[PDB]
Amino acid sequence: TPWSGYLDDVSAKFDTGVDNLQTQVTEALDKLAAKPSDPALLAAYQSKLSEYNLYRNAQSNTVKVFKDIDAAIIQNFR
């Protein structure tokens, strides 16, 4: 927060793009852990975990792409 760059901004836009998934997934995790045989709890967990996976993958590739654009420009200062 005190200091953040452009890459930090690109990253943070996902962390606020998904409002509460960050907690929902941990919540569902222990609801299930209390009763791992309930079909409704299983189905509820499978989708939240899939959405968390895709959220992290999509976040990381973007930051890499921007790093490569910036390194390519900086290479030409000399």
């Binding site: 927060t1 606020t16 793009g17 409002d19 509460n20």
Partner: protein, 51 residues
């Protein structure tokens, strides 16, 4: 008299050059009517952030 005046003035100026004016102080200010933190809330359409 002219020579002395000119020399002394010039040298004094060069000396005062190094005298320091930039002395930082530290203030402390309690907030009486609000929280210091970035309160944050979830709306139907938009994650709402209070800076």
């Amino acid at each position: 008299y002219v020579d002395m005046v000119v020399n002394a003035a010039t040298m004094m100026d060069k000396q005062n050059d190094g005298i320091e004016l930039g002395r930082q102080k530290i203030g402390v200010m309690r907030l009486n009517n609000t929280f210091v933190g970035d309160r944050t809330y979830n709306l139907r359409d938009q994650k709402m952030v209070i800076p």
